[PDB]
Coordinates of C-alpha atoms and ligand atoms in Angstrom, one line a residue:
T1 CA -200.1 -23.9 -188.9
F2 CA -196.8 -24.2 -187.1
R3 CA -196.8 -27.4 -185.0
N4 CA -195.5 -27.6 -181.4
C5 CA -194.0 -31.0 -180.6
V6 CA -192.5 -32.2 -177.4
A7 CA -189.6 -34.7 -177.3
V8 CA -188.5 -36.5 -174.2
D9 CA -184.9 -37.9 -174.7
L10 CA -183.5 -39.9 -171.8
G11 CA -179.9 -40.9 -172.0
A12 CA -177.7 -42.7 -169.4
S13 CA -176.1 -39.4 -168.4
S14 CA -179.0 -36.9 -168.7
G15 CA -182.7 -36.5 -169.6
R16 CA -184.2 -33.7 -171.5
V17 CA -187.7 -32.4 -172.4
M18 CA -187.5 -30.2 -175.5
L19 CA -190.0 -28.3 -177.6
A20 CA -189.8 -28.1 -181.4
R21 CA -191.6 -25.6 -183.5
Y22 CA -192.1 -26.7 -187.1
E23 CA -193.8 -25.3 -190.1
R24 CA -193.7 -27.1 -193.4
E25 CA -194.1 -24.1 -195.7
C26 CA -191.1 -22.4 -194.1
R27 CA -189.0 -25.5 -193.8
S28 CA -188.3 -24.0 -190.4
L29 CA -187.4 -26.2 -187.5
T30 CA -186.5 -24.8 -184.1
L31 CA -185.7 -26.6 -180.8
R32 CA -185.8 -25.1 -177.3
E33 CA -184.9 -26.9 -174.1
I34 CA -187.7 -26.9 -171.5
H35 CA -186.2 -29.1 -168.7
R36 CA -182.8 -30.8 -168.4
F37 CA -182.2 -33.2 -165.5
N38 CA -179.6 -35.6 -164.3
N39 CA -179.7 -39.3 -164.9
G40 CA -177.1 -41.8 -164.0
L41 CA -176.8 -45.0 -162.1
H42 CA -177.9 -45.5 -158.5
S43 CA -176.7 -48.0 -156.0
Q44 CA -179.9 -49.4 -154.5
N45 CA -179.9 -52.4 -152.2
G46 CA -176.7 -53.9 -153.7
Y47 CA -177.9 -53.4 -157.3
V48 CA -177.2 -50.8 -159.9
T49 CA -180.6 -49.2 -160.8
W50 CA -182.4 -46.3 -162.5
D51 CA -184.5 -43.9 -160.4
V52 CA -187.5 -44.2 -162.7
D53 CA -189.9 -42.3 -160.3
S54 CA -187.6 -39.2 -160.4
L55 CA -187.3 -39.5 -164.2
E56 CA -191.1 -39.7 -164.5
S57 CA -191.6 -36.6 -162.3
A58 CA -188.9 -34.7 -164.3
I59 CA -190.8 -35.6 -167.5
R60 CA -194.1 -34.4 -166.1
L61 CA -192.5 -31.2 -164.8
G62 CA -191.3 -30.4 -168.3
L63 CA -194.6 -31.3 -169.9
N64 CA -196.5 -29.2 -167.3
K65 CA -194.1 -26.2 -168.0
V66 CA -195.2 -26.2 -171.7
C67 CA -198.9 -26.6 -170.7
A68 CA -198.7 -23.7 -168.1
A69 CA -197.1 -21.5 -170.8
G70 CA -200.4 -21.9 -172.7
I71 CA -198.7 -23.5 -175.8
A72 CA -200.9 -25.7 -178.0
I73 CA -199.1 -29.1 -177.8
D74 CA -199.7 -31.1 -181.0
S75 CA -197.8 -34.2 -179.8
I76 CA -195.4 -35.8 -177.4
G77 CA -192.9 -38.6 -178.0
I78 CA -190.3 -40.4 -175.8
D79 CA -187.0 -42.0 -176.6
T80 CA -184.5 -43.6 -174.2
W81 CA -181.4 -45.7 -174.0
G82 CA -182.0 -49.3 -175.2
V83 CA -182.1 -52.8 -173.6
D84 CA -183.5 -51.9 -170.2
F85 CA -187.1 -52.6 -169.0
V86 CA -189.6 -52.3 -166.2
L87 CA -191.8 -55.2 -165.0
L88 CA -195.4 -54.5 -164.2
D89 CA -198.0 -56.4 -162.2
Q90 CA -201.7 -56.8 -163.3
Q91 CA -202.5 -53.3 -161.9
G92 CA -199.5 -51.6 -163.4
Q93 CA -197.4 -51.4 -160.3
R94 CA -193.6 -52.1 -160.6
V95 CA -192.3 -55.6 -159.8
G96 CA -188.8 -55.8 -158.4
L97 CA -186.2 -53.0 -159.0
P98 CA -185.5 -51.2 -162.2
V99 CA -182.1 -52.7 -162.7
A100 CA -179.8 -51.0 -165.1
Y101 CA -177.8 -52.6 -167.9
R102 CA -174.5 -51.8 -166.0
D103 CA -175.5 -54.2 -163.2
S104 CA -173.4 -57.4 -162.9
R105 CA -176.4 -59.8 -162.4
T106 CA -175.9 -60.9 -166.0
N107 CA -172.2 -61.9 -165.6
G108 CA -171.6 -65.3 -167.3
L109 CA -175.1 -65.6 -168.8
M110 CA -174.2 -64.6 -172.4
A111 CA -171.6 -67.3 -172.5
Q112 CA -174.1 -69.8 -171.1
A113 CA -176.7 -68.9 -173.8
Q114 CA -174.0 -69.4 -176.5
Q115 CA -173.1 -72.8 -175.0
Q116 CA -176.7 -74.0 -174.6
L117 CA -178.3 -72.5 -177.7
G118 CA -175.3 -72.0 -180.1
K119 CA -173.6 -68.6 -180.8
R120 CA -174.5 -68.9 -184.5
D121 CA -178.1 -69.9 -183.7
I122 CA -178.7 -66.8 -181.5
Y123 CA -177.0 -64.6 -184.1
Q124 CA -178.9 -66.0 -187.1
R125 CA -182.2 -65.6 -185.2
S126 CA -181.6 -62.1 -183.9
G127 CA -178.9 -60.5 -186.1
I128 CA -178.0 -58.7 -182.9
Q129 CA -174.4 -58.1 -181.5
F130 CA -173.4 -60.0 -178.4
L131 CA -173.4 -57.6 -175.5
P132 CA -173.3 -59.3 -172.1
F133 CA -176.1 -57.0 -170.8
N134 CA -178.6 -57.6 -173.7
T135 CA -182.2 -58.0 -172.4
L136 CA -182.0 -61.7 -173.4
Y137 CA -179.5 -62.2 -170.6
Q138 CA -181.1 -59.8 -168.1
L139 CA -184.4 -61.7 -168.2
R140 CA -182.4 -65.0 -167.7
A141 CA -180.8 -63.3 -164.6
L142 CA -184.2 -62.1 -163.3
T143 CA -186.0 -65.5 -163.7
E144 CA -183.1 -67.5 -162.3
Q145 CA -182.2 -65.2 -159.4
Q146 CA -185.7 -63.8 -158.5
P147 CA -188.1 -66.7 -159.1
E148 CA -190.5 -65.4 -156.4
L149 CA -191.2 -62.3 -158.5
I150 CA -192.2 -64.3 -161.6
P151 CA -195.9 -65.0 -160.8
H152 CA -196.5 -61.3 -160.1
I153 CA -195.4 -60.2 -163.6
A154 CA -198.2 -59.3 -166.1
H155 CA -196.1 -57.2 -168.5
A156 CA -192.6 -56.1 -169.3
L157 CA -192.2 -52.7 -170.9
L158 CA -189.0 -51.4 -172.5
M159 CA -188.0 -48.0 -170.9
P160 CA -189.6 -45.6 -173.5
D161 CA -192.8 -47.6 -173.5
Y162 CA -192.8 -47.6 -169.7
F163 CA -192.9 -43.8 -169.7
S164 CA -195.4 -43.7 -172.5
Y165 CA -197.6 -46.0 -170.4
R166 CA -197.2 -43.8 -167.3
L167 CA -198.5 -40.9 -169.4
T168 CA -201.3 -42.6 -171.3
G169 CA -202.3 -45.7 -169.4
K170 CA -201.7 -47.6 -172.6
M171 CA -199.0 -50.2 -173.3
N172 CA -196.9 -50.4 -176.4
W173 CA -194.0 -52.5 -177.7
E174 CA -192.0 -50.2 -180.1
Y175 CA -190.0 -52.0 -182.8
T176 CA -186.8 -50.1 -183.0
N177 CA -186.1 -50.6 -179.3
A178 CA -187.5 -54.1 -179.2
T179 CA -184.7 -55.1 -181.5
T180 CA -182.1 -54.1 -178.9
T181 CA -183.3 -57.0 -176.7
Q182 CA -181.7 -59.8 -178.7
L183 CA -185.3 -61.4 -178.4
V184 CA -186.7 -60.3 -181.7
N185 CA -186.5 -62.6 -184.7
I186 CA -185.0 -60.7 -187.6
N187 CA -187.2 -62.5 -190.2
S188 CA -190.5 -62.0 -188.5
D189 CA -190.2 -58.7 -186.6
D190 CA -191.8 -60.6 -183.7
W191 CA -190.5 -62.1 -180.4
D192 CA -188.4 -65.3 -181.0
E193 CA -190.1 -68.2 -179.1
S194 CA -186.8 -70.1 -178.6
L195 CA -185.0 -67.0 -177.2
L196 CA -187.9 -66.1 -175.0
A197 CA -188.0 -69.7 -173.7
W198 CA -184.3 -69.7 -172.8
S199 CA -184.6 -66.3 -171.0
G200 CA -187.5 -67.6 -168.9
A201 CA -189.7 -64.8 -170.0
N202 CA -193.3 -65.3 -171.1
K203 CA -194.5 -64.1 -174.5
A204 CA -197.7 -62.9 -172.8
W205 CA -195.6 -60.2 -171.0
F206 CA -195.1 -58.5 -174.3
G207 CA -197.1 -57.5 -177.4
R208 CA -196.4 -57.7 -181.1
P209 CA -193.7 -55.0 -181.9
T210 CA -195.2 -52.0 -183.7
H211 CA -193.3 -49.8 -186.1
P212 CA -192.9 -46.1 -185.2
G213 CA -195.7 -43.7 -185.8
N214 CA -198.7 -45.0 -184.0
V215 CA -200.6 -43.1 -181.4
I216 CA -200.1 -45.0 -178.1
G217 CA -202.7 -42.9 -176.3
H218 CA -203.2 -39.5 -174.9
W219 CA -201.9 -37.3 -172.2
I220 CA -203.8 -34.4 -170.5
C221 CA -202.4 -31.0 -169.4
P222 CA -203.9 -29.6 -166.1
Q223 CA -206.4 -28.1 -168.6
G224 CA -208.1 -31.2 -170.0
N225 CA -207.1 -31.1 -173.7
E226 CA -206.0 -34.5 -175.3
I227 CA -202.5 -34.6 -176.6
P228 CA -201.4 -37.7 -178.6
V229 CA -198.5 -39.6 -177.3
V230 CA -196.8 -41.0 -180.4
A231 CA -194.5 -44.1 -180.5
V232 CA -191.3 -42.7 -182.1
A233 CA -188.2 -44.6 -183.0
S234 CA -188.0 -45.0 -179.3
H235 CA -184.4 -46.4 -179.1
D236 CA -182.4 -43.2 -178.6
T237 CA -179.8 -44.4 -181.2
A238 CA -182.6 -45.0 -183.7
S239 CA -183.8 -41.4 -183.2
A240 CA -180.2 -40.1 -183.5
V241 CA -179.7 -41.9 -186.8
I242 CA -182.9 -40.4 -188.2
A243 CA -181.6 -36.9 -187.5
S244 CA -178.1 -37.6 -188.9
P245 CA -178.0 -35.8 -192.3
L246 CA -176.8 -38.9 -194.2
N247 CA -176.1 -38.3 -197.8
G248 CA -176.6 -41.6 -199.7
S249 CA -174.9 -45.0 -199.5
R250 CA -171.4 -43.5 -198.8
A251 CA -172.4 -41.9 -195.5
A252 CA -171.8 -43.4 -192.1
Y253 CA -172.8 -42.2 -188.6
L254 CA -171.2 -42.0 -185.1
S255 CA -173.8 -41.4 -182.5
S256 CA -171.6 -40.1 -179.7
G257 CA -172.8 -39.9 -176.1
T258 CA -172.3 -42.3 -173.1
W259 CA -171.9 -44.9 -175.9
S260 CA -170.3 -44.4 -179.3
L261 CA -172.5 -46.2 -181.9
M262 CA -170.8 -46.3 -185.2
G263 CA -172.6 -47.7 -188.3
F264 CA -174.5 -47.3 -191.5
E265 CA -178.1 -47.9 -192.8
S266 CA -179.1 -50.8 -194.9
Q267 CA -182.3 -52.1 -196.5
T268 CA -181.1 -55.6 -195.6
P269 CA -179.3 -57.1 -192.6
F270 CA -175.9 -58.7 -192.5
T271 CA -175.9 -61.9 -190.5
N272 CA -173.1 -63.8 -192.4
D273 CA -169.9 -65.1 -190.9
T274 CA -168.1 -61.8 -191.6
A275 CA -170.7 -60.0 -189.5
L276 CA -170.7 -62.6 -186.8
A277 CA -166.9 -62.6 -186.4
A278 CA -167.0 -58.7 -186.2
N279 CA -169.8 -58.9 -183.7
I280 CA -171.8 -56.4 -185.8
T281 CA -175.5 -55.6 -184.9
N282 CA -178.5 -55.1 -187.2
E283 CA -180.7 -52.9 -185.0
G284 CA -184.2 -51.9 -186.2
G285 CA -184.7 -48.5 -187.8
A286 CA -187.5 -46.3 -189.0
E287 CA -188.8 -47.4 -192.4
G288 CA -187.3 -50.9 -191.8
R289 CA -183.8 -49.4 -192.5
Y290 CA -181.5 -51.5 -190.4
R291 CA -178.9 -49.8 -188.3
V292 CA -175.8 -51.9 -189.0
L293 CA -173.5 -50.8 -186.3
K294 CA -171.2 -51.7 -183.4
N295 CA -171.3 -50.5 -179.9
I296 CA -168.1 -48.7 -178.7
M297 CA -167.6 -48.1 -175.0
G298 CA -167.4 -44.4 -175.8
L299 CA -167.3 -41.3 -173.5
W300 CA -168.6 -43.4 -170.5
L301 CA -164.8 -43.8 -169.8
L302 CA -164.4 -40.1 -169.5
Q303 CA -167.6 -39.5 -167.6
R304 CA -166.2 -41.9 -164.9
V305 CA -162.8 -40.2 -164.9
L306 CA -164.4 -36.8 -164.5
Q307 CA -166.3 -37.9 -161.4
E308 CA -163.3 -39.8 -159.8
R309 CA -160.8 -36.9 -160.3
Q310 CA -163.4 -34.2 -159.5
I311 CA -163.0 -32.4 -162.8
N312 CA -165.8 -29.8 -163.3
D313 CA -164.6 -28.0 -166.5
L314 CA -164.8 -30.4 -169.4
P315 CA -164.0 -27.8 -172.1
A316 CA -160.9 -26.9 -170.2
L317 CA -159.8 -30.5 -169.9
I318 CA -160.3 -31.0 -173.7
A319 CA -158.2 -27.8 -174.4
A320 CA -155.4 -29.1 -172.1
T321 CA -155.5 -32.5 -173.7
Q322 CA -155.0 -31.0 -177.1
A323 CA -151.4 -30.0 -176.0
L324 CA -150.4 -33.6 -175.1
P325 CA -148.7 -35.8 -177.7
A326 CA -150.9 -38.5 -179.2
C327 CA -150.9 -42.3 -179.0
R328 CA -148.6 -42.8 -176.1
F329 CA -151.4 -44.5 -174.2
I330 CA -153.6 -47.0 -176.0
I331 CA -156.2 -49.2 -174.5
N332 CA -159.1 -51.2 -176.0
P333 CA -162.1 -49.3 -174.7
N334 CA -164.4 -52.2 -175.7
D335 CA -162.7 -54.6 -173.2
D336 CA -165.3 -55.9 -170.8
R337 CA -163.2 -54.6 -167.9
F338 CA -164.5 -51.1 -168.7
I339 CA -168.2 -51.8 -168.6
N340 CA -168.5 -50.9 -164.9
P341 CA -165.2 -51.1 -162.9
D342 CA -165.3 -49.7 -159.3
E343 CA -162.2 -47.5 -160.1
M344 CA -162.1 -46.3 -163.8
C345 CA -158.7 -44.4 -163.6
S346 CA -157.0 -47.4 -161.9
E347 CA -158.5 -49.8 -164.6
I348 CA -157.2 -47.6 -167.5
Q349 CA -153.8 -47.4 -165.8
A350 CA -153.7 -51.2 -165.2
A351 CA -154.6 -51.8 -168.9
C352 CA -151.8 -49.5 -170.0
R353 CA -149.2 -51.1 -167.7
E354 CA -150.2 -54.6 -168.9
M355 CA -149.3 -53.5 -172.4
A356 CA -145.8 -52.2 -171.4
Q357 CA -146.9 -48.6 -172.1
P358 CA -146.3 -45.5 -170.1
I359 CA -148.9 -44.9 -167.4
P360 CA -151.5 -42.1 -168.0
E361 CA -151.7 -40.3 -164.7
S362 CA -152.6 -36.6 -165.0
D363 CA -156.3 -35.6 -165.8
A364 CA -155.2 -34.6 -169.3
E365 CA -153.3 -37.9 -169.8
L366 CA -156.3 -40.0 -168.8
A367 CA -158.4 -38.0 -171.3
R368 CA -155.7 -38.3 -173.9
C369 CA -155.6 -42.1 -173.5
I370 CA -159.4 -42.2 -173.8
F371 CA -159.6 -40.0 -176.9
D372 CA -156.8 -41.7 -178.9
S373 CA -158.1 -45.2 -177.9
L374 CA -161.6 -44.3 -179.1
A375 CA -160.3 -42.8 -182.3
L376 CA -158.3 -45.9 -183.1
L377 CA -161.3 -48.1 -182.4
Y378 CA -163.5 -45.8 -184.6
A379 CA -161.0 -46.4 -187.5
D380 CA -161.1 -50.1 -186.9
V381 CA -164.9 -50.3 -186.9
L382 CA -165.4 -48.1 -189.9
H383 CA -163.0 -50.3 -191.8
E384 CA -164.9 -53.5 -190.6
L385 CA -168.2 -51.9 -191.7
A386 CA -166.9 -50.9 -195.2
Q387 CA -165.3 -54.4 -195.7
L388 CA -168.6 -56.0 -194.6
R389 CA -170.9 -54.2 -197.0
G390 CA -168.4 -53.9 -199.9
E391 CA -168.6 -50.2 -200.0
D392 CA -166.4 -47.3 -198.7
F393 CA -167.7 -44.2 -197.0
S394 CA -167.0 -40.6 -198.1
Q395 CA -168.3 -38.9 -195.0
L396 CA -168.8 -39.7 -191.3
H397 CA -171.5 -37.9 -189.4
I398 CA -170.8 -37.4 -185.7
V399 CA -173.9 -36.5 -183.7
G400 CA -174.8 -36.3 -180.0
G401 CA -173.2 -34.5 -177.1
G402 CA -169.8 -36.1 -178.1
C403 CA -169.9 -34.1 -181.4
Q404 CA -169.1 -31.0 -179.3
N405 CA -165.6 -32.5 -178.6
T406 CA -163.6 -30.8 -181.4
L407 CA -160.5 -32.7 -180.4
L408 CA -162.1 -36.1 -180.8
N409 CA -163.9 -35.0 -184.0
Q410 CA -160.5 -34.2 -185.6
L411 CA -158.9 -37.4 -184.2
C412 CA -161.7 -39.4 -185.6
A413 CA -161.3 -37.8 -189.1
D414 CA -157.5 -38.3 -189.0
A415 CA -157.5 -41.9 -187.7
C416 CA -160.3 -42.9 -190.2
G417 CA -158.9 -40.8 -193.1
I418 CA -162.4 -39.6 -193.8
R419 CA -164.2 -36.3 -193.8
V420 CA -166.1 -35.8 -190.6
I421 CA -169.3 -33.7 -190.4
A422 CA -170.3 -32.8 -186.8
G423 CA -173.9 -32.0 -185.8
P424 CA -176.6 -31.8 -184.8
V425 CA -175.8 -32.1 -181.1
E426 CA -179.3 -33.2 -179.9
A427 CA -179.8 -35.7 -182.7
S428 CA -182.0 -38.1 -180.6
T429 CA -184.3 -35.2 -179.7
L430 CA -184.6 -34.2 -183.4
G431 CA -185.3 -37.7 -184.7
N432 CA -188.0 -38.1 -182.0
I433 CA -189.6 -34.8 -183.2
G434 CA -189.3 -36.1 -186.8
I435 CA -191.4 -39.2 -186.3
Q436 CA -194.0 -37.1 -184.5
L437 CA -194.2 -34.7 -187.5
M438 CA -194.8 -37.7 -189.7
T439 CA -197.7 -38.9 -187.7
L440 CA -199.1 -35.3 -187.9
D441 CA -198.9 -35.4 -191.7
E442 CA -196.3 -32.5 -191.6
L443 CA -193.4 -34.5 -193.0
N444 CA -193.3 -37.4 -195.4
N445 CA -190.2 -39.5 -194.6
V446 CA -186.8 -39.7 -193.0
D447 CA -184.9 -38.5 -196.1
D448 CA -187.1 -35.3 -196.2
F449 CA -186.4 -34.8 -192.5
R450 CA -182.6 -35.1 -193.0
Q451 CA -182.9 -32.3 -195.7
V452 CA -184.6 -30.1 -193.0
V453 CA -181.8 -30.9 -190.5
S454 CA -179.1 -30.2 -193.0
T455 CA -180.5 -26.7 -193.7
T456 CA -181.3 -25.9 -190.1
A457 CA -178.6 -27.4 -187.8
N458 CA -175.0 -26.2 -187.2
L459 CA -172.7 -28.5 -189.2
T460 CA -169.0 -28.4 -188.8
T461 CA -166.6 -30.1 -191.3
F462 CA -163.4 -31.7 -190.1
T463 CA -161.1 -32.5 -193.0
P464 CA -158.7 -35.5 -192.5
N465 CA -155.0 -34.5 -191.9
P466 CA -152.6 -37.1 -193.4
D467 CA -149.7 -35.6 -191.5
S468 CA -151.2 -35.7 -188.0
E469 CA -149.7 -37.7 -185.1
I470 CA -152.6 -40.2 -185.1
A471 CA -152.6 -40.4 -188.9
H472 CA -148.8 -41.2 -188.8
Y473 CA -149.5 -43.8 -186.0
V474 CA -152.3 -45.5 -188.1
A475 CA -150.1 -45.6 -191.2
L476 CA -147.4 -47.4 -189.2
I477 CA -149.8 -50.1 -187.8
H478 CA -150.8 -51.0 -191.4
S479 CA -147.4 -52.2 -192.7
Ligands
LIG1 N1 -169.4 -28.6 -174.1 C1 -168.9 -29.9 -174.4 N2 -167.8 -30.1 -175.1 C2 -167.4 -31.4 -175.4 N3 -168.1 -32.5 -175.1 C3 -169.2 -32.3 -174.4 C4 -169.8 -31.0 -174.0 N4 -170.9 -31.2 -173.4 C5 -171.1 -32.5 -173.3 N5 -170.1 -33.2 -173.9 C6 -170.0 -34.7 -174.1 O1 -171.3 -35.2 -174.4 C7 -171.5 -36.4 -173.6 C8 -173.0 -36.5 -173.4 O2 -173.5 -36.8 -174.6 P1 -175.1 -37.2 -174.7 O3 -175.4 -37.5 -176.2 O4 -176.0 -36.2 -174.1 O5 -175.1 -38.6 -173.9 P2 -176.2 -39.6 -173.4 O6 -175.7 -40.9 -174.1 O7 -176.1 -39.7 -171.9 O8 -177.5 -39.2 -173.9 C9 -170.8 -36.0 -172.3 O9 -170.4 -37.2 -171.6 C10 -169.6 -35.3 -172.8 O10 -168.5 -36.2 -173.0
LIG2 C1 -177.9 -49.7 -173.8 C2 -177.1 -48.8 -174.8 O1 -177.6 -47.5 -174.7 C3 -177.7 -46.9 -176.0 O2 -179.2 -46.8 -176.3 C4 -177.2 -45.5 -176.1 O3 -177.9 -44.7 -175.1 C5 -177.1 -47.9 -177.0 O4 -177.5 -47.8 -178.3 C6 -177.4 -49.2 -176.2 O5 -176.5 -50.3 -176.6

């Protein structure tokens, strides 16, 4: 009566196949890693792409490991990073390259859309934040720059649905991730005809978006037994929010990985002029609970620094960084210059120099700049969100790999002046498992699932310190 559910969670920096064991009567939820594998950008023929074939093989390797162990798999579910897609021909073969959202093909196109359609028009239709790599702009790039591919395209699948298709042979268009495209009309939960038209994409390439929980199809162990593949809240951030142990209207989340996604949950979207000016997004959530959030460039900046300076001990870097004084180097991490510069360290240094600040040069200084700059932006955004909804927050839940950074957890609490609760680490995996359990009739809703997480996961409390360096800094930049 315990259920064995497999979650595939693909992030920009890593993929993971994990196995959960759940039994309702016990309120016991355990999670084991089956297969962890690298993911990251590839330079391929002058483009920045994903190696989808290696990701698919890695997923299969993990699934086949569970099968060969003789475990009765009750379900499988897949979540990935948002926005990106794979084009398919009439026989399901890939068309063109699997270009990544970090690619520069889209440069200038978001401004073009605003000029031709109207910024307010796009925002009112979609309720989605302006990011220059939104799918809306990617499809414009594709149809403009690669017209010869167009007749060959039968379907476009967002990344999670692409892998679900490779496992089942069936196509799906999952709602929570569909909303990341800036192509879904917020009033209809269906593709917006005017936005599709501008992109050059064909409505026939898609299907009506379907809310999480449906059985997409089945996958088969080397044995022959049919295992349902479930559409989960397939946008990784949507899954992370599900597993965040939010406690009522006064709780916010910070989903911390490659990106930092800071937001709250709402029954209704915010598309007013305040939201528009703040560039706030209203992403689709399980249960129709909007994820009202902002993208923050996040630990991407550090990932790049680590590779450039050949740093292989991140815990040591964090410990060293703790000893450096705070707020000497402040950049705006959300500046477009940081999306994909060739030289991240140089870009951070240039930004600091431009602002008449000392230059962060040691490994620990670069890390310090990143952590303080993120924490100040966290405080800015949390303020914007509270102001927008007309309600303060009493706790901030930090989840994701980033929630292991105890330095950044405390900086966030101190800058925001809010209690921080860190954990679970693998929130996307857990929310993916949650929806699967719901389709199995083992769990009733997201709120019930969060009660499980809160009695199962390791949660660490960071109390705001009013006398901290960053708290003192924030106090000064108010008056
Ligand atoms: N032991 C650790 N201590 C502190 N931070 C960590 C640790 N392990 C990983 N991280 C942070 O977590 C990030 C990865 O978070 P994750 O949620 O897996 O990202 P993705 O968005 O790629 O799925 C890494 O870039 C790193 O900054
Ligand atoms: C493309 C970006 O990647 C994420 O899904 C985080 O992995 C984020 O929510 C999107 O904006």
